[PDB]
Design a binder for this molecule. Structure first.
Ligand SMILES: Nc1nc2c(ncn2[C@@H]2O[C@H](COP(=O)(O)OP(=O)(O)OP(=O)(O)O)[C@@H](O)[C@H]2O)c(=O)[nH]1
Ligand SMILES: Nc1nc2c(ncn2[C@@H]2O[C@H](COP(=O)(O)OP(=O)(O)OP(=O)(O)O)[C@@H](O)[C@H]2O)c(=O)[nH]1
Ligand SMILES: [Mg+2]
Ligand SMILES: [Mg+2]
Lengths: 171, 171
């Protein structure tokens, strides 16, 4: 088993391409209310799943929901791709503002694993170019995560490592 | 600053090429008795400086001293190159046996930084091929550290980041 230590009051930032298994992971390890996803926040703005003008407002809504939860001292998991630095930066700022530890959990899986899961999804799919781009962005993000302000950086390098994770909420 | 969190019962394993600044780092951040260097244990075996004929014995003594400190529940920093898995593995096993968290602090500096510092050392110097080898070994080691059993893995990627380091002990 791979034991990942997280403080009782953390902002757990999931980082991974579409299809990397973020939401599945979040569901397996955390309570439903602890998880705030970008899909959920987009849904608050538009019942139209494919509306792109909504993304900006949806990020604002996600950041604000996270802020209020953390302000209440409630461990929160951000279930979004988070492969761009510009997406991670305000999350880290939020964590610092409410004196929480930002934790990075990176789904460092090969692009082919993500592409294959995507092809087999029955809930919703993305285009292949999206996952190609996400994976490149994820890879380029890894080295710099600690310096970005993540207090603990956990890189999961394979599906088996992902599957072996157990969180320890000691601190 | 770069805040690195360690539990008060930690085995802190410094990982880095000769000349990467491990001993300098250890002296800056820890008490002298918390730090056990391979050089010190070598000195217990031989009055000659950096005697290479007693290496096996020196590391045996290091392992023994480390395990006795952990046994007494004392935080210990292992100040050796630790760029080989075979050197790290017994430290991890010792930590496990004494219910201590092994922490990796990796000096991921460019080879040229270590080569350059080496030529200006007053205590002792190594040949260039040694530092080239150490650096290759260190870089190969990074990805697998968490899987090896290190609970926290902190990678320092430049002298500036090494400089900014502050430890936060959680007892
Ligand atoms: N076998 C296996 N399948 C998985 C695992 N994680 C996810 N999957 C499958 O991969 C598909 C996508 O997983 P999600 O958890 O939706 O991926 P995501 O990272 O949330 O994707 P986006 O929401 O598009 O960013 C699902 O159909 C899952 O069945 C896993 O650990 N093992
Ligand atoms: N300018 C500067 N010099 C440093 C720094 N850290 C170490 N040095 C110098 O680099 C040289 C080697 O540093 P050490 O701490 O002995 O390196 P080490 O990793 O212990 O090397 P070994 O014991 O041979 O494995 C010394 O001359 C230090 O003074 C630093 O942060 N800044
Ligand atoms: Mg999802
Ligand atoms: Mg030294």
């Amino acid at each position: 088993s791979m034991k990942l230590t997280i403080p009782e009051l953390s902002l757990v930032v999931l980082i991974g391409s579409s299809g990397s298994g973020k939401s599945t992971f979040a569901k397996k390890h955390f309570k439903p209310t602890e998880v705030i996803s970008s899909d959920f926040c987009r849904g608050l703005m538009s019942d139209d799943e494919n509306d792109q003008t909504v993304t900006g407002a949806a990020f604002d809504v996600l950041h604000y929901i996270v802020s209020k939860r953390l302000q209440l001292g409630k461990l929160t998991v951000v279930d979004a791709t988070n492969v761009q630095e510009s997406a991670r930066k305000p999350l880290i700022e939020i964590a610092k503002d409410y004196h929480c530890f930002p934790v990075a959990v990176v789904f460092n899986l090969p692009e082919k694993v993500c592409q294959e899961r995507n092809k087999n999804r029955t809930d919703r799919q993305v285009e292949e170019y999206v996952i190609r781009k996400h994976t490149q962005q994820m890879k380029k993000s890894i080295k710099g995560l600690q310096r970005e302000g993540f207090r603990y950086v956990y890189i999961l390098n394979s599906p088996e490592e992902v599957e072996e994770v157990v969180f320890e909420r000691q601190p």
